[PDB]
Hints:
The complex is a heterododecamer, with two copies of chain A, four copies of chain C, two copies of chain G, two copies of chain I and two copies of chain K.
Chain A: H1 10-19, E1 24-25, H2 29-54, E2 59-60, H3 62-70, E3 76-77
Helix pairs in contact in A: 2-3
Chain C: E1 19-22, E2 33-36, E3 41-45, E4 50-55, E5 65-72, H1 86-90, E6 104-106, E7 113-116, E8 123-128, E9 138-145, E10 160-167, E11 173-184, H2 187-197
Parallel strand pairs in C: 3-11
Antiparallel strand pairs in C: 1-4, 2-3, 4-9, 5-8, 5-10, 6-9, 7-8, 10-11
Chain I: H1 8-18, E1 23-24, H2 26-53, E2 58-59, H3 61-71, H4 74-93
Helix pairs in contact in I: 2-3, 3-4
Chain H binds a DNA duplex through helix 2 and strand 1.
PDB class: gene regulation
Keywords: Tumour suppressor, transcription factor, gene regulation
Assembly: 14-meric
Amino acid sequence: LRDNIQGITKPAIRRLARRGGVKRISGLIYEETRGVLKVFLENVIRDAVTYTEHAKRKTVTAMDVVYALKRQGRTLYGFGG
Amino acid sequence: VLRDNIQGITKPAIRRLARRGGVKRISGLIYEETRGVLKVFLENVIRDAVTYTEHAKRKTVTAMDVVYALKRQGRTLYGFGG
Amino acid sequence: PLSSSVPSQKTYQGSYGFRLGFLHSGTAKSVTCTYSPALNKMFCQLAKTCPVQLWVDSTPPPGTRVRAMAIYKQSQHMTEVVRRCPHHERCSDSDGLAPPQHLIRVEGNLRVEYLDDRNTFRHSVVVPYEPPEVGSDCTTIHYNYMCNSSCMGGMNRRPILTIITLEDSSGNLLGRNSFEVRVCACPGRDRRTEEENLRK
Amino acid sequence: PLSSSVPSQKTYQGSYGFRLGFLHSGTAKSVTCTYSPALNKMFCQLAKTCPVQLWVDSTPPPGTRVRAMAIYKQSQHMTEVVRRCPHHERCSDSDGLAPPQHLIRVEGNLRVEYLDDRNTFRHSVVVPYEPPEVGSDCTTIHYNYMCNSSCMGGMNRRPILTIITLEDSSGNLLGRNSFEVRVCACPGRDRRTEEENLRK
Amino acid sequence: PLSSSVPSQKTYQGSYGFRLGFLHSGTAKSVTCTYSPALNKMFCQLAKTCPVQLWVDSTPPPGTRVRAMAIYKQSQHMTEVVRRCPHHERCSDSDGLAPPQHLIRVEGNLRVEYLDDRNTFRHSVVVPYEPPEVGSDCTTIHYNYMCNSSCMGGMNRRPILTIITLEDSSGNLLGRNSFEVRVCACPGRDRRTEEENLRK
Amino acid sequence: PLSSSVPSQKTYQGSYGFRLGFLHSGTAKSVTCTYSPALNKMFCQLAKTCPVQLWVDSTPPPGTRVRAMAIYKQSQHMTEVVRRCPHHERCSDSDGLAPPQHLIRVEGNLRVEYLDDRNTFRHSVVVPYEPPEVGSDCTTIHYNYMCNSSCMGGMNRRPILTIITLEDSSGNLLGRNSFEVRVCACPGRDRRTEEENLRK
Amino acid sequence: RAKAKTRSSRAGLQFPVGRVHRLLRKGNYSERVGAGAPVYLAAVLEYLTAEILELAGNAARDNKKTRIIPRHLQLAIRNDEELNKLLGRVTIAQGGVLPNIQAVLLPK
Amino acid sequence: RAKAKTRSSRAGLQFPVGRVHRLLRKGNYSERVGAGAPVYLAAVLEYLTAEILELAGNAARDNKKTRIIPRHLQLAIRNDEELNKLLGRVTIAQGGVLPNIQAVLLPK
Amino acid sequence: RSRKESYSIYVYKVLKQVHPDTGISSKAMGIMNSFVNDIFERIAGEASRLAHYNKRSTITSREIQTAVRLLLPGELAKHAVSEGTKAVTKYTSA
Amino acid sequence: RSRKESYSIYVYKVLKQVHPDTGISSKAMGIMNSFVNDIFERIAGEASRLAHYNKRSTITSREIQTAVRLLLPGELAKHAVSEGTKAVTKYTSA
Amino acid sequence: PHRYRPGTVALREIRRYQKSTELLIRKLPFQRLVREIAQDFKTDLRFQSSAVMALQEACEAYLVGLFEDTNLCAIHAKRVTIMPKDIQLARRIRGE
Amino acid sequence: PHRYRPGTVALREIRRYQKSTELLIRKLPFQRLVREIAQDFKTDLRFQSSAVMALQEACEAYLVGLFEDTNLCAIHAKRVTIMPKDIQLARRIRGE
DNA sequence: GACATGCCCGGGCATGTTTGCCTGGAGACTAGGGAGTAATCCCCTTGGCGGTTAAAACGCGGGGGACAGCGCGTACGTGCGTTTAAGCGGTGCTAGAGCTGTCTACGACCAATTGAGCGGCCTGCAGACCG
DNA sequence: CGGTCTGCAGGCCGCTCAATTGGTCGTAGACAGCTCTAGCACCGCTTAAACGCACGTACGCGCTGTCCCCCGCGTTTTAACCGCCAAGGGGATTACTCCCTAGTCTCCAGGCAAACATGCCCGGGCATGTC
């Protein structure tokens, strides 16, 4: 797979900022946002995979994601806990 | 506050602290805002430390009581034991 | 209504060797009366001629009489009086000798008598006995049955036994026989059906 | 016995648009009651519920009554009074409201009346009329027929017409309708049989 | 209500060799009455004919009578009086001889008597004893059970024993026998089930 | 016994927008009361709590009352008074407020009144109306049904409709709704069965 | 051999005491668990549970809905200051956000 | 019995395997502890210890000291962004701070 | 199914005692289950450390009571302490 | 007096491997003792949860190895893993 | 003609997106992004459907909170338009 | 004569205090402040000297870090003087 | 002979009770932990006096902060056109989840050896005597 | 002044106590293999909402100018902190003895789900009447 980072479209970024109360957006925000999002998402993935590898599975489950998030100060409710 | 205990944190002392943080120039309103922030920090740490001391039923607060109280607020202190 | 008692049905040949015989009629669609030895059963139509043969080893004394009476074959119904159904009891078919409610009649005999027993409430028909004619070993009585076995309020599809008694002047018992009776429409069809089912 | 007259069977909707309706019951072998539009004929079991719907274009006055009567369909028999057969007439099945001899009863209704007509000798059953609730289009009366069409001495396999008449509080004719009736043990089998014979 | 006592169920053949017998009816799903020697149990439908045979080695004196009474089989219910349920007690099904509340009736017999025991509160039915016909070996009484075993407020699904007593003209005990009874909708199915369970 | 009239079952929301509501209970084995919106039908166990909600668009005047009455759903049985069966009528289960014969009771309310209507012979239970408690959109009445739908002599497997009427202090109609009721041992099994048969 | 009393019933609680007794005693929280400890904790959990549900039920009624949904839990937790500390960093599926619009952004 | 030898000597470690084994068996970390477990852990702690001490020794030398003091630990840790991250929430007694000045503050 | 013991029953009963008319969505119930586990782990974890710090082997109501104060804001803490006090007080008294 | 433990001897030995000529002050030694204890607690705590989630009862070198990777930055992790690997490998051969 | 004045649509969008609860990122693209990242560490890794949703909700929550803080930073500079500097400042203050 | 401008020795102070390690607050005032706070929770409590020293170091570290973020916020507003609202912003971003 | 009409047995559904499996509580016995008391003595608190930096105060001057204005661009809004996501469906297999069996491992205990601390003995440094 | 021996301070050798190591025994947790099923992965077709791109206009951001006050640095004055010292007792710590609680093991009752037993209604076949 390639370039799906662009799949986070400019309107999607608008809608997220809108939920955060943002009224007006400069064009460079789109590129900056994608970089930030990627790092956050990657770090969570890496931990969740590390758990999956410890269990010696080949499939990630929601609980791996929950643990991966949790330790970063991100307790998540609704997917089990 | 008793005899002006919070004012015991003097204006020059506040200056010196901000200097380490790279602060070049300071507005006069800063001093009271700093004192408020400092008191909250102390109140929270002291309260938890006392809670540990009471649980042990001791009557003197020891360094370990402080170290634990700090730790759980997301801040770990080295050198005072622990 | 119900009777206070049940007439005996036991076969009793007596001092005269009394026994019953029946004609060798076929099983065609247009037949009015036919008998089955395999079932000891007569199949006949309403109001048609039913020949019953009286056989004996020796001749009973003069004044001997022959009586026919009907009872239900199933033991729980035995105390009910066999009679005509309320329809045939009301209809205008009396011959001038038989009471309207009697199931069994005798035709061709002027010396017939019909009894409604004051103590048992049973109906019966009686005629004098006569010894056989030249060329016969038996005496023939022609009965008529005046309701179908299926008549509701009457026999109500319940099988009946005709009891034939040979009797003296006082009504004491000289001999007794019995046969099952089905009064129907189509005796030939019905006899063949019951006789075919005897192999099933 | 025989009546002095024949009731008129002619359909007459009158001022109130009087009509009859019947339920869309199927033809399962022993369905208690079923109706055939092709024959204008009801098929029903003895003593069972027979729903007949009364339809009107406007509500008749209070004190209006609904009467039911039966006549034979064949013109040779139209003068005979349709009544119960002698068996069902004698049996002890009166509900405390109906006379023993009446063919048609109405169930459920405490205000029913039974008439033996002094002039015509005809039996009939009557109830007060009641209107439906404002969003329902018809009133249902539940009749019972107390003999089978095959009852000997009674209907004797002869078909009958039930005649329904709407009347005022004095008995004057406000409307009239009719339908053929067969009373039998297997209304579904028989309805299919007669609807099949309509092609033969 | 509850009785002051429980009737003895102990078998006692006495001076006359009194025993019971039953007919060899099949286990067709809804046969009206059938008996199981393996269980000593009768299976029958409500109000239907239940033939019970009486066997004796010698004929009891004239004036001897036969009585039937019902008790619950389970020891915890033996003190309750077996009676009809409040529904079948109110129904208008009396034959002109039996009281409304009695569970057991005898059909056919005009000389039947019904007793409600002033001391024990137990119901029972009695008839005169009759000897067999000349070539028969036993006498048949036809009982009817007037509630299902399942009747709520009555037997309430609890099994019962019918106790039969041979008695003199004054009620003195000449012999005693008993059998379990189930009054149900499908006596053949139920008998096969209880006989199959005997292998489980 | 029978009734001289039939209560109106027609839905009428009236000036106050009257409607019924029911709890969202499931269909598990251990359910005591459950309601089907697809059938407009309540399934419940005998004598268990059956909550019925009353919903309105505006509040009725003080002195308004709420009445419940049962009728048979089938039109031929509509004139029979729905009552408890003879067994449950005799059993000692009255709460000190409800007569022994009434099918429907209200629990928890001291202002309850039970009516045996002198002119129609109908049973009904009545309580005062109250507006919802603070924080609620509806008012809940707790009913109990005191016989199973299958009780012989009583409902006898016939479906019933409970009619609920909002009425003034004189008894004049303000609003009306109805729902079908089945009283049974396993409400969840039965509800799922009828909801599955809705696709057949 | 007297007839038993379930331990939650004996305390007056809804939460099942016997479960907590097992749970505290595993996951290696301690070497030993004292008999009053599970009782105390069950009550605490029960209290906090009730407070959330109470607030969420009000939040559901404000939207005139008969059923509590994740959004109602979110509103309860953020409107209550103390819950917004205890659960401050919790993420809730389909929680949404409070309708916070800064005054400087409003039209003028 | 045979001539014994120390577990740390067998592993070539300076840190005491026996102490680590005892510690892992307590703290209520687990019901059971495997033989290689303390061995692996001791090596890790020893490795990280070496990294800090090496950088701190360099820092001490730049200040012409022949002895490590808390200040030299502080500087050494911050000068390696890996350790800075690992210890990103640690306060060092007498650690001081880094001599960082923002360019916008310098005169012109 | 072979899955962990949820708290759904008791959560539902607690709601009924507070808002008797209301119901719960599957996702709301799942959230409450995660919530209970979270608070449980915190208290049990801190109570563990209290015993460890004090070299003592047994968790008692006190370790929980202390942990409750450390974890909960003061307002919630006092109410929770009152309830925990009563439950234990009653249980030992009865 | 009662008995106590610290890592001071081993810290001192390690320092002489990287800087044979350099001493360490007790204030610095205090920091190092706190550092060792902190890292120890983290690894032991995380390894405990790994066993817990996978329902094992026994901590092995694998749980420690995985915990190390979750705790340490990547560069330090690679070297730490290599040393732990050798230590266990050699210890097994020894 | 008619056109809405710039910002008047934005305020209505702010209300709508704050009020609703659905996911703002199109699901299939997000799933591809997850895999595009994960592959760099390990090929052939399978994912549970639920796990992907868990990741997405955490991401949207993270970005939404980030934007609110970013918004305050721009407000503090008395701008209304947000700039990359505002994002960087907020993150840096949180030690990211 | 010779003297510097407003805003010169302040910069030399930054260099000096960033370089040293000792406390910048006075000892006895701090002790009283600790006890005067502590007595609110419980009277008559005693303290080890090391306990007070621990509190001082934690407090100085906390404030100094806060001033760094505050300074960045002032730079973001393109000021040089720090304002109370600069502190408030940083604290709020950090979830306080 | 063909068809028309009724009852019994079989099949299916409707309606209620008994049996089986899992979980929680109650009772009894064994070992350690916790609690209480006595004693020892170190550390904390309190108080004193002297020395001196640090803090507090006031003045003067300059830079920074603030407010207002103007210009041009970047963003927002809307229209028309294009693409892919979502929805629903179909097909194939890998891995997850659970069970059963067996072994090697770790826990536990006792015995032995080395390390650390303390006591006693020896060596170096400082002091005294001899050459 | 130079060389040799004795006492005190520091280091070394032996003993005591504790910790670590080695070896033996016991019981189970973990590893391994196997089986069954669910969910995930991959592909297709259709419908429409969302996304892309272009054009027009305006509000915003950016840069500049001008004004005033607040903050910085300096010098002088006052206050409190810091340093070292001394005394008293409370509290913490250590050791010793006694009682209760929790853990572990065995047994009984209750709660929840599935299967069987029994009643009621319709269809098929056989039995019997009509044409």
